[PDB]
Amino acid sequence: DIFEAQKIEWHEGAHMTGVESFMTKQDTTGKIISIDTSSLRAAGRTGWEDLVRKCIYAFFQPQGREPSYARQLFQEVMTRGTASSPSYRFILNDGTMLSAHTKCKLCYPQSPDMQPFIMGIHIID
């Protein structure tokens, strides 16, 4: 049904072959409450912890004079229920330049004991 369909896209995001990504869950104050890295750890690439840390820091870093993409997306996802960033870049510990973009959605769980939350997917370009 409608509640179940909400989970389809995020289950698919957790098993994408050929795409480097991770997912986050934020409460509605914006605080990150979980980070799912199972796709990165399965793909056996070493340096995933550094990739995730650097990607998240770039996501929350101010964009010159504008707010960070994290702020812009959080503001938009609370008002309209979905949001997306353009690409942002970061440098791994070995000097490699990478870029990423983020998409997120407000999710309304069926269980009365759970609060709404924001699911985010961060895709390496």
Binding site: K31, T37, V52, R53, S68, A70, R71
Partner: peptide
């Protein structure tokens, strides 16, 4: 919102 602190991130990986 507040960005995660280094301890927030540490916890997110630890558990």
């Amino acid at each position: 919102l507040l960005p995660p602190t280094e301890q927030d991130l540490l916890k997110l990986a630890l558990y």
